[PDB]
Design a protein around this ligand. Structure first.
Ligand SMILES: [Ca+2]
Ligand SMILES: [Ca+2]
Ligand SMILES: [Ca+2]
Ligand SMILES: [Ca+2]
Lengths: 160, 158
């Protein structure tokens, strides 16, 4: 059997930090947002601690924007019962997310509360579009109990 | 003149609608969803818009022999995010299945894809193992060869 497991998925690119519509391609000089989901297995023995997202630009010239302010540069929402219950995504408190790194090529965010079995976190991250070459980002999820690696690669077409 | 985009939408427990999944338990079916999106600034419509999906890691397989409405679905949103028209299924004859096997599928949309329009592809897979499945999805057209590629990953509970 298995004690703990995590999943990651890309949801694509968006024109707003929360709600709004999907985009890609994006015109050079515009802000756009990446969204990723980290999901705890419903069969997990208990809560998972130090659930971390690490996102790095691998290709292209788009940069993660700003200095890393919650509600502007990034947002983290918790769906407490995931797809197993009718509770919706809601923003978490500022004190629940630690910004371990925030730079143009790389961000790292840790969720401090434990993540219950079946619960899902949605991360939204602001980028600045630059160039006529595709931007690719690698997104990696870990917890103390489930180190992974769990990795996706999302690609954005930037119109020059 | 022309440009295309691709995005992963993650994994689902149904071919259309239902809810998001991942992790998946071994022995269950699940569905990958990908979107190909024509640039709204494109000169004209784009022909032979193709999705190629291949397994890069793990043991999960694309399921069945490639029957529309069972193993895969293609939906068109004719104005994409720029207009309030929704996704609707396309006719069986609008989608050419160039390849369909356990490690690889290739699907071509035969009508031309208008500037700003989006295609959403759903593909049935069989979950096997205690190692992550990774799939590579590539989009191409005649006028925007790309290739444009994403890599989506599924946790399989053994
Ligand atoms: Ca996934
Ligand atoms: Ca819920
Ligand atoms: Ca994309
Ligand atoms: Ca629409």
């Amino acid at each position: 059997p298995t004690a703990y497991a995590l999943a990651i998925s890309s949801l694509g690119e968006f024109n707003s930090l929360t709600g709004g519509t999907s985009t890609d391609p994006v015109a050079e000089g515009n802000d756009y947002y990446y969204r990723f989901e980290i999901r705890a297995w419903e069969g997990s023995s208990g809560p998972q601690t130090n659930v971390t997202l690490n996102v790095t630009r691998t290709l292209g010239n788009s940069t993660f924007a700003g200095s890393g302010t919650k509600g502007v540069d990034f947002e983290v929402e918790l769906d407490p019962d995931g797809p197993f219950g009718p509770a919706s995504y809601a923003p978490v408190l500022s004190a629940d997310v630690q910004v371990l790194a925030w730079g143009p090529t790389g961000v790292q965010l840790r969720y401090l509360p434990s993540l219950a079995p079946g619960a899902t976190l949605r991360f939204s991250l602001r980028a600045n579009a630059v160039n006529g070459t595709n931007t690719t980002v690698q997104a990696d999820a870990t917890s103390t109990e489930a180190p992974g690696p769990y990795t996706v690669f999302e690609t954005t077409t930037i119109i020059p």
